């Protein structure tokens, strides 16, 4: 009878198909849902392995090296920096070929994301219900943009660089703009 929703920790007083569909599409359910799945992954990534590490029993140990610890504030800071950087490296994709093929005859059928025919009917159907208040499509041909360097496009963006090694670049480029 009762449908317990483990995420929402609420009940449905009598199970049927329509209250299930309407609940699983419900924005409250999706929010608590997404919080939970993110939460399980960040727990499992956070959780240290802590293996048994069965220590064996063993002259040539003459060299001794200095360990490097950090302050508890310094520990917490560098861990926060690493958290932010993991979160960047997972999320970031590479644009380029979108920005590269901007003027193209069939850019607006192929890279404009639901004119592709293959994934195309998804993004229309995957559009959320838009009950609250408040596209470059196939019509584009060659003669829309005849001459791309008439109406100024922005240049190719300068490539990105690690700030950890940003100090070690070539100073003083040849050929000033």
């Amino acid at each position: 009878t009762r449908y317990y929703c483990e995420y929402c920790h609420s009940y449905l007083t009598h199970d049927t198909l329509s209250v299930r569909k309407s609940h699983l599409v419900g924005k409250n359910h999706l929010r608590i849902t997404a919080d939970y799945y993110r939460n399980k992954a960040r727990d499992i990534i956070n959780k240290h392995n802590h293996k048994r590490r069965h220590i064996g029993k063993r002259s040539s140990q003459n060299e001794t090296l200095k360990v490097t610890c950090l302050s508890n504030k310094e520990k917490r800071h560098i861990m926060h920096v690493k958290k932010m950087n993991q979160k960047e490296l997972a999320q970031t994709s590479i644009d380029t070929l979108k920005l590269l093929y901007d003027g193209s005859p069939g850019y607006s059928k192929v890279f404009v994301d639901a004119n592709r025919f293959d994934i195309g009917d998804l993004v229309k159907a995957s559009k959320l219900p838009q009950r609250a208040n408040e596209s470059r499509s196939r019509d584009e041909t060659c003669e829309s943009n005849p001459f791309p360097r008439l109406n100024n496009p922005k240049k190719l963006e300068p490539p990105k660089i690690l700030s950890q090694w940003s100090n070690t670049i070539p100073k003083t480029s040849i050929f000033y703009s």
Binding site: T1, E6, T13, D15, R20, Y37, A41, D118, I119, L122
Partner: protein, 93 residues
């Protein structure tokens, strides 16, 4: 009612599953909606015939009692359905 596994299949909605059928066909695609009776509806389906070919359905609806198994994604390994001790917040009255 349901029991744990078909509750899991009710959980993995809209995510890339792979079905073998009893014929040996292994459909694969996004899972539109499963029912309690394991009739499952799928989208962007890529199909492997028993002969070894591959094709692409858009929109399939495979009946439950010819499913051989279904593979959901990995993360549902960690799911609140599996929690053996989660206590019930005072069922309705």
């Amino acid at each position: 009612m349901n029991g744990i596994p078909v509750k899991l299949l009710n959980e993995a909605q809209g995510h890339i599953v792979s079905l073998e059928l009893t014929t040996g066909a292994t459909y694969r695609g996004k899972l539109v909606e499963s029912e309690d009776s394991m009739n499952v509806q799928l989208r962007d389906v890529i199909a492997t015939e028993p002969q070894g070919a591959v094709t692409h359905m858009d929109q399939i609806f495979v009946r439950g009692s010819q499913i051989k198994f279904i593979v959901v994604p990995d993360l549902l390994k960690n799911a609140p359905l599996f929690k053996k001790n989660s206590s019930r917040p005072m069922p309705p009255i």
